[PDB]
Design a protein around this ligand. Structure first.
Ligand SMILES: [Fe+3]
Ligand SMILES: [Fe+3]
Ligand SMILES: [Fe+3]
Lengths: 194, 263
């Protein structure tokens, strides 16, 4: 009735393989470790595609043609799967078989998704907004602001236009953080973490 | 038994205030580190009842000390303004070799010395007694966990926030009976319960999703041992993080009141 933990015993045995779709097969299919890894893989899958459904138009409904090579490429470049997760999927897409089908309609969802993830999970008390820039988004940025009022009806992520031209980032993307909820300085773009 | 509900999203404010008016819950449990940039008085004035604190992303087992201390200081101020009935956090594994897990890991309970020293540091920063929640185990750490939490509580003075449905997940997944937790259940005042789902590819493996009505074996658990759960000052937070639907929540809230009547 229970599923055998099979060649392992505890979660710590599986840590290294929780984000690796290629090594999942190495566990017996009827084993608990195979299931545990599968719940983890699906968390990554749904975090990517539930938030940015238009990416499935690129890959098809299974998402396999993005998800499998991107997860392999993420391990290769030792990506952190931090708030910039979605931005790094877009970077991968730019060198992928899908590179010709990227437009503003794919770009803005992944920028919103990363600004949203930053403002939901970052715990730096001293940073209240993230500002995201892109070479494919001239003169604007995507700003994610932590909640500072229980009674806001504005979305926590907005697109904001700058009156003074903004330098294009060196990479596809750049970011900076602000203390408090204004943009009263441009310190220059930082490159994506990791 | 007081019955609580967890507040995580600001868009659920009007619903939670409705549950307070209709006397469906008696306190609100804040996922408080979601709100560390709000004015603390605005939260206190939003809920016409006591509150309690649940900390999700302190990551106190791994976070660097400077960022951890700043978060602690901010939370200490929230504790002064709102006087939460209790303050609680987790024993979770968030990051493997610099890579964030999106489905959080069960710590290895062999690592007691590491967890002990981190717990003491974080409890010290918060300035109050900390309660630590059990994990909805999938792998066989479920068998180690009760003895681990009792030792940890003895040596550091933390309390245990006992999540009944996480333990039922652990039992369904690993065989570890929920009776292993009897001593902790008769000790702590503070409890959690929620619905759980299943792994998409294996219905026998239970996932702690908080998106669903409480299962029958979770309800038998609470009912079978209602005198062990219920105490002076006992509280139980119902958790609903997804499909946050007013009417389904009210079914589960009423079923808890059926099990734990007011007098
Ligand atoms: Fe929790
Ligand atoms: Fe819980
Ligand atoms: Fe739970």
């Amino acid at each position: 009735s229970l599923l055998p933990t099979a060649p392992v015993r505890i979660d710590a045995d599986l840590y290294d393989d929780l984000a690796n779709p290629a090594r999942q097969s190495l566990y017996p299919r009827d084993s608990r470790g195979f299931i545990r890894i599968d719940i983890s893989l699906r968390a990554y899958w749904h975090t990517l595609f539930d938030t940015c459904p238009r990416l499935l138009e690129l890959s098809g409904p299974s998402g396999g043609a993005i998800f499998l090579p991107f997860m392999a490429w993420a391990r290769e470049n030792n990506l952190a799967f931090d708030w910039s997760f979605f931005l790094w999927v877009y970077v991968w897409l730019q060198q992928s078989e899908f590179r010709e089908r990227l437009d503003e309609d794919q770009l803005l969802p992944v920028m919103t998704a990363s600004a949203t993830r930053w403002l939901m999970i970052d715990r730096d008390i001293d940073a209240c907004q993230i500002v995201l820039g892109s070479r494919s988004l001239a003169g604007a940025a995507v700003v994610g602001a932590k909640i500072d009022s229980i009674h806001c009806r504005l979305e926590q992520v907005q697109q904001v236009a700058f009156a003074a031209p903004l330098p294009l980032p060196d990479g596809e993307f750049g970011y900076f953080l602000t203390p408090g909820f204004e943009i009263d300085h441009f310190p220059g773009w930082r490159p994506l973490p990791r | 038994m007081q019955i609580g509900f967890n507040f995580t999203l600001t868009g659920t404010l009007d619903m939670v205030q409705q549950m307070i008016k209709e006397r469906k819950i008696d306190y609100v449990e804040m996922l408080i580190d979601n709100f560390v940039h709000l004015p603390p008085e605005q939260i206190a004035d939003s809920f016409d009842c006591p509150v309690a604190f649940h900390i999700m992303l302190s990551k106190y087992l791994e976070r660097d000390r400077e960022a951890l201390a700043a978060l602690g200081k901010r939370l200490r101020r929230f504790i002064d303004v709102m006087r939460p009935v209790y303050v609680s956090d987790h024993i979770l594994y968030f990051t493997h070799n610099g890579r964030s897990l999106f489905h959080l890991g069960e710590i290895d309970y062999g690592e007691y010395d590491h967890v002990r020293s981190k717990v003491e540091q974080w409890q010290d920063m918060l300035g109050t007694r900390l309660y630590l929640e059990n994990y909805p185990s999938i792998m066989d750490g479920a068998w180690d966990a009760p003895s681990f939490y009792e030792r940890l509580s003895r040596e550091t003075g933390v309390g245990v926030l006992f999540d009944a449905s996480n333990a039922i997940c652990a039992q369904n997944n690993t065989g570890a009976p929920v009776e292993l937790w009897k001593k902790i259940i008769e000790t702590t005042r503070h409890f959690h319960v929620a619905g759980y789902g299943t792994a998409f590819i294996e219905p026998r493996v239970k996932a702690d999703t908080h998106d669903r009505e409480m299962a029958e074996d979770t309800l038998d658990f609470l009912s079978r041992m209602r005198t062990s759960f219920d105490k002076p000052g006992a509280t139980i937070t119902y958790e609903r993080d997804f499909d946050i639907d007013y009417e389904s929540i009210s079914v589960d809230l009423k079923r808890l009141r059926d099990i734990f009547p007011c007098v």
